[PDB]
Amino acid sequence: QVQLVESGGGLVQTKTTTSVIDTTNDAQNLLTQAQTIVNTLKDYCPILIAKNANTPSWQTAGGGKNSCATFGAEFSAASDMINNAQKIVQETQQLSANQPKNITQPHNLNLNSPSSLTALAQKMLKNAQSQAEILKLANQVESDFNKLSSGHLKDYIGKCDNQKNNWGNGCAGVEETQSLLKTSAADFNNQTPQINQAQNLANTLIQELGNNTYEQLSRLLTTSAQAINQAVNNLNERAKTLAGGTTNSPAYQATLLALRSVLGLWNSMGYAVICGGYTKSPGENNQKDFHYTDENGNGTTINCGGTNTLKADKNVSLSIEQYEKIHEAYQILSKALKQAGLAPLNSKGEKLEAHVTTSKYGSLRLSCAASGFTFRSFGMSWVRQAPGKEPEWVSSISGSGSDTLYADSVKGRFTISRDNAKTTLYLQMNSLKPEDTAVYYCTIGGSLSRSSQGTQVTVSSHHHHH
Amino acid sequence: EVAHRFKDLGEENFKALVLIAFAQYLQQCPFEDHVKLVNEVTEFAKTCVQEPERNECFLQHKDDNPNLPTAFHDNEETFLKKYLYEIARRHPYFYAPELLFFAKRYKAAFTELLPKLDELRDEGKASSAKQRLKCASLQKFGERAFKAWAVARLSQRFPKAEFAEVSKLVTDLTKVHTECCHGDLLECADDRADLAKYICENQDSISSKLKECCEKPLLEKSHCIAEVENDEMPADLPSLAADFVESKDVCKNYAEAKDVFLGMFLYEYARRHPDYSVVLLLRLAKTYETTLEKCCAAADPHECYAKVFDEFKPLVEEPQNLIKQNCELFEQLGEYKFQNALLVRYTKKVPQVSTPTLVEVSRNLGKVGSKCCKHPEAKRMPCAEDYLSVVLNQLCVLHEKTPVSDRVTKCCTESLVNRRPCFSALEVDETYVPKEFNAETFTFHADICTLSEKERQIKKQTALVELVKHKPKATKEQLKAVMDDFAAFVEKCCKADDKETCFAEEGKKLVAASQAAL
Numbered sequence: 013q014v015q016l017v018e019s020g021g022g023l024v025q026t027k028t029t030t031s032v033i034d035t036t037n038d039a040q041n042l043l044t045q046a047q048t049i050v051n052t053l054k055d056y057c058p059i060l061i062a063k064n065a066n067t068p069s070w071q072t073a074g075g076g077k078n079s080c081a082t083f084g085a086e087f088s089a090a091s092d093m094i095n096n097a098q099k100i101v102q103e104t105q106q107l108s109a110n111q112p113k114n115i116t117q118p119h120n121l122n123l124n125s126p127s128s129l130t131a132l133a134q135k136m137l138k139n140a141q142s143q144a145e146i147l148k149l150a151n152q153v154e155s156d157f158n159k160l161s162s163g164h165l166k167d168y169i170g171k172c173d174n175q176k177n178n179w180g181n182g183c184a185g186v187e188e189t190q191s192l193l194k195t196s197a198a199d200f201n202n203q204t205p206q207i208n209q210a211q212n213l214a215n216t217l218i219q220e221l222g223n224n225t226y227e228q229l230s231r232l233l234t235t236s237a238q239a240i241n242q243a244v245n246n247l248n249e250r251a252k253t254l255a256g257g258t259t260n261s262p263a264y265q266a267t268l269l270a271l272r273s274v275l276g277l278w279n280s281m282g283y284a285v286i287c288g289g290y291t292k293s294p295g296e297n298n299q300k301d302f303h304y305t306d307e308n309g310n311g312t313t314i315n316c317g318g319t320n321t322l323k324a325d326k327n328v329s330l331s332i333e334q335y336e337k338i339h340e341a342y343q344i345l346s347k348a349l350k351q352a353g354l355a356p357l358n359s360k361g362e363k364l365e366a367h368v369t370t371s372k373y374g375s376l377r378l379s380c381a382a383s384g385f386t387f388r389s390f391g392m393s394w395v396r397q398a399p400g401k402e403p404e405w406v407s408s409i410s411g412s413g414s415d416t417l418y419a420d421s422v423k424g425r426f427t428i429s430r431d432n433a434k435t436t437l438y439l440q441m442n443s444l445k446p447e448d449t450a451v452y453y454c455t456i457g458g459s460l461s462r463s464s465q466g467t468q469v470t471v472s473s474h475h476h477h478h
Numbered sequence: 479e480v481a482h483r484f485k486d487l488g489e490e491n492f493k494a495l496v497l498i499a500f501a502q503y504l505q506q507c508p509f510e511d512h513v514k515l516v517n518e519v520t521e522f523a524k525t526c527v528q529e530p531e532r533n534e535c536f537l538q539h540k541d542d543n544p545n546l547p548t549a550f551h552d553n554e555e556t557f558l559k560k561y562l563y564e565i566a567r568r569h570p571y572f573y574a575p576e577l578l579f580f581a582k583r584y585k586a587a588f589t590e591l592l593p594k595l596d597e598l599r600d601e602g603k604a605s606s607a608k609q610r611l612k613c614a615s616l617q618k619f620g621e622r623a624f625k626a627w628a629v630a631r632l633s634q635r636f637p638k639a640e641f642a643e644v645s646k647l648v649t650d651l652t653k654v655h656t657e658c659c660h661g662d663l664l665e666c667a668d669d670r671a672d673l674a675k676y677i678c679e680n681q682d683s684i685s686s687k688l689k690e691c692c693e694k695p696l697l698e699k700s701h702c703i704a705e706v707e708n709d710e711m712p713a714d715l716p717s718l719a720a721d722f723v724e725s726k727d728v729c730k731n732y733a734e735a736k737d738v739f740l741g742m743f744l745y746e747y748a749r750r751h752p753d754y755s756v757v758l759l760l761r762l763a764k765t766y767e768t769t770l771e772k773c774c775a776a777a778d779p780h781e782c783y784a785k786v787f788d789e790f791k792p793l794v795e796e797p798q799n800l801i802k803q804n805c806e807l808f809e810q811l812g813e814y815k816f817q818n819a820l821l822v823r824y825t826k827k828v829p830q831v832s833t834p835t836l837v838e839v840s841r842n843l844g845k846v847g848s849k850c851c852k853h854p855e856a857k858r859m860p861c862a863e864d865y866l867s868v869v870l871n872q873l874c875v876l877h878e879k880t881p882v883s884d885r886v887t888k889c890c891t892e893s894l895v896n897r898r899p900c901f902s903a904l905e906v907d908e909t910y911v912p913k914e915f916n917a918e919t920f921t922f923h924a925d926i927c928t929l930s931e932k933e934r935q936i937k938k939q940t941a942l943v944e945l946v947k948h949k950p951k952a953t954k955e956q957l958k959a960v961m962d963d964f965a966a967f968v969e970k971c972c973k974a975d976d977k978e979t980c981f982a983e984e985g986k987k988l989v990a991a992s993q994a995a996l
């Protein structure tokens with residue numbers, strides 16, 4: 013007599029908390045949000061999931077090894093974009109801090125004293141030096157983006173393509189921002205003759221201040237009189253669009269590229285990152301599901317914690333706290349890149365409310381103690397009843413356990429696993445919804461039932477913390 | 479216990495039963511000492527009106543081949559008594575109730591030619607070799623093999639019986655055959671009578687054709703029970719696929735009871751196809767089981783064991799098309815020309831077998847066609863395996879004694895289920911060396927005109943075989959040309975006034991035509 017004795021769990025109550033963060037869409041904040049993603053990825057270097065044309069090339073390649081083994085130069089190029097884009101936010105601060113002034117009185121010594129012309133020439137060249145540095149830094153992150161692309165995340169970042177998730181793709185608009193950065197830095201590099209003339213003109217004046225006062229004023233009154241005014245004019249017009257501009261500023265399109273690219277690499281690769289590593293109490297469940305609801309409503313979820321719990325070291329998974337900060341920084345970056353946008357580098361920034369939804373207690377494994385037959389050479393399966401509805405096959409496994417089949421409704425959450433020794437079939441359910449309420453029975457092949465089955469309860473509670 | 483035994487079937491048969499009892503066990507002792515021993519036990523049986531290894535020692539004493547080998551009108555009692563005692567002491571395991579049944583035909587024919595004397599004895603020794611074969615098949619292969627065969631056989635015989643009664647009949651029938659293979663007439667024969675009685679009580683649930691057998695007494699009852707004509711199926715049965723492969727839970731019911739589920743498959747398939755050979759039914763069962771074993775361990779066995787009937791079709795195509803192609807060839811050719819064609823084919827594929835052995839094999843193979851090709855296709859394949867089993871087992875048994883070739887040794891030692899197929903599809907033996915030409919085999923003497931027609935056939939066929947062993951170039955143009963000229967030469971020179979001259983003068987003329995050509 014074949015004996016199938018299902019001994020799983022019963023009542024599950026899955027709590028899920030949405031906590032809304034109030035932040036700002038200014039550049040230096042989003043840059044810190046992006047540093048959280050990248051630095052955590054490099055400094056701790058998590059093992060990738062070792063899963064196949066459908067799956068990415070880097071997946072079958074660097075799967076089962078640490079992340080930096082596959083995305084070393086991609087993490088480095090991403091960190092460079094972030095730190096360089098931070099420098100251009102600092103340098104536009106110094107740019108707007110040093111704004112030169114026009115020559116008011118052409119023929120006077122009361123005002124327009126030697127000290128005022130000295131300070132004005134200083135403001136001229138400090139303004140031009142700051143402008144030159146952020147143009148260099150803008151083309152610097154452009155090269156760092158060409159390095160981040162055309163590597164392992166080429167045909168991934170920059171292409172976008174419930175339902176099928178959009179993981180593995182950039183879907184962050186980096187091709188569009190880059191093209192604007194190209195045209196933006198193109199027009200500004202064309203203004204290089206003007207900024208070089210303003211640089212030298214200020215350097216002639218600092219030497220002309222060494223000349224005698226009345227003697228040099230004689231030739232200054234009569235020419236480098238309007239020349240300064242002209243030069244100072246295009247120098248201030250340049251610094252305005254260089255800081256306050258959006259599509260016109262290489263500094264805006266550079267910071268926007270560094271943020272969208274950090275969103276791109278996490279959209280392309282973050283799903284493979286192993287999380288849930290234990291810090292203490294070896295085996296602590298810590299199973300927290302991190303929800304990823306994109307802007308159009310189609311939400312995914314990543315099951316982090318959990319024979320699935322190992323340490324939380326460098327090159328050895330990540331802690332739930334570490335993934336919590338990655339998830340917060342992603343959701344704060346997703347919004348304000350999708351809704352608010354990037355506030356101009358000279359602007360103060362506007363407020364936005366970014367939700368971070370995460371659930372707990374949504375996991376449960378079942379066990380079927382098979383006996384009375386040759387369990388090792390029989391493909392087993394799980395089926396669930398539910399009230400009134402016909403029996404629904406959820407999953408099935410082969411005799412050796414290598415072949416696993418799952419239904420579309422279950423696909424992505426549950427995982428079948430047999431034990432040929434000790435002859436016990438398991439079904440590990442994760443991220444389970446109230447619509448999973450059903451009595452579960454294991455079966456040899458499928459269809460009907462011949463056992464005392466499992467238990468049928470699932471309840472979900474949601475909290476909106478502020 | 480001798481009371482109920484003696485009141486059944488009369489007083490006469492118990493005398494001969496005691497006779498052949500020890501006449502089979504101890505064989506070298508004479509005749510008159512057995513007769514007095516018969517009366518010794520017989521009169522005490524009328525007066526009233528062991529341990530396992532003990533009978534195994536008696537079985538070891540059984541010598542299957544002993545060193546011992548008007549009168550009816552004068553005293554048929556002692557005449558048949560010696561005849562029965564002599565058959566018993568020749569074959570120590572021969573069917574004892576059939577021995578008495580053959581004695582009834584023996585005394586009835588004497589009280590009333592070549593078929594009468596030859597066919598009677600050779601049928602008995604052929605049946606004697608049949609239980610030896612079924613016992614040798616019981617061993618080596620096992621009780622499960624016999625179980626499976628019996629399931630397919632008697633479920634073809636009684637399709638109206640449920641699987642429970644068929645499987646029941648199989649279990650007790652295996653017990654009967656294991657006891658009769660142990661020569662234990664204390665356990666066999668009565669089990670044969672118990673099973674014959676049991677079949678007669680529940681005759682309605684098995685088959686109605688058994689009504690003639692239950693009116694017969696205990697002897698011929700179980701005899702004709704082994705001879706019952708098959709009963710007709712309900713002629714309304716569904717496709718067994720709907721309960722075996724088209725349906726689900728196949729791997730479920732297989733895990734519940736593997737052999738029982740496999741027996742349900744064979745019971746349904748055989749009861750639907752009586753026109754198939756029992757060997758074919760076991761071919762289909764072993765293919766279904768191997769398919770079930772492979773598919774049940776997959777993640778999705780339904781898509782796996784589906785299209786298993788595509789594996790069944792070629793296993794039934796190969797023998798069926800061989801039946802119709804050899805029947806139609808024998809139909810247009812006749813028995814003799816069919817035997818000649820059989821001579822060429824089997825000497826082509828394996829010329830290493832002796833020339834005589836190839837001759838009578840091809841002869842009786844033509845007799846196989848002469849017997850079965852008269853029956854319709856509904857009974858062709860069963861008829862074919864009934865004779866091909868004995869014939870193939872016969873040449874196999876003799877081949878183990880004198881190993882001639884390796885292809886036949888391989889085919890004889892493989893499974894009995896794939897013997898006829900493996901013997902078929904055997905290509906012409908490659909690299910066979912043309913035998914040395916010796917003209918003494920091509921000598922024709924006037925005795926062939928005086929020889930009997932049956933003898934004439936063997937003299938022509940033996941020359942045909944030895945001809946094939948020389949110059950293996952066997953394009954049918956040269957074969958037909960040799961047959962045309964030689965058959966005309968034999969008759970034209972037989973009608974000559976001095977055949978001794980005609981045979982020798984046109985012999986080398988046709989030899990120089992047989993040679994100087996290939």
